[PDB]
Design a binder for this molecule. Sequence first.
Ligand code: CL
Ligand code: CL
Ligand code: CL
Length: 221
Amino acid sequence: ELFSNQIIWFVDDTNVYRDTIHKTFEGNLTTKPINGAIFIFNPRTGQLFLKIIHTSVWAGQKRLGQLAKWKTAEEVAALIRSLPVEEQPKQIIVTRKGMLDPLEVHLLDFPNIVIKGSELQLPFQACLKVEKFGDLILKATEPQMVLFNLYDDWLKTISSYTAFSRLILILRALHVNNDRAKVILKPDKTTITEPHHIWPTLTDEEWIKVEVQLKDLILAD
Ligand SMILES: [Cl-]
Ligand SMILES: [Cl-]
Ligand SMILES: [Cl-]
């Protein structure tokens, strides 16, 4: 399925509508939208299209959580239209079932694209506390798209399958227990992440140990 000659995108809309809530001194709830993002991810190549969603899009609107699914579908369609046909996905896998109907209705001009849901646990939400992404999203003053390579230099020495599995363990572990996962991912005082990389520079042996530890962290839940 994944990794063939077919271009596949995972689309995660979870983080499009975000807010903070607090109690006023008068005892009422204040809900303040904050910037969000769509994650559109190619598991073969590691390519991420990060569409930052600025809070201005919600101006004058209600039911923002529901509207966000439709915004997501509109943005996926716009991205597809901006790409040459040879770069357009053959399959889009939505991580949440609420995306199925909105995306169906917005992709009617793309009969070659198959849309399906998934039960896979792919928490791109964890990226919001990876500082690179977190501050970029927080501080944006308008919508924009940013490209990333979520596999860093891994594909020089491992397959797409291996890289995808590593990424998922990282994201799930960060999701389950951010603080512990970050410790696991920094095995040495001298462990660094390159400025243009997302993840640390680790030896092959270090990654073996990391992968087991991340898996165990996810199991411990
Ligand atoms: Cl779902
Ligand atoms: Cl949903
Ligand atoms: Cl998870």
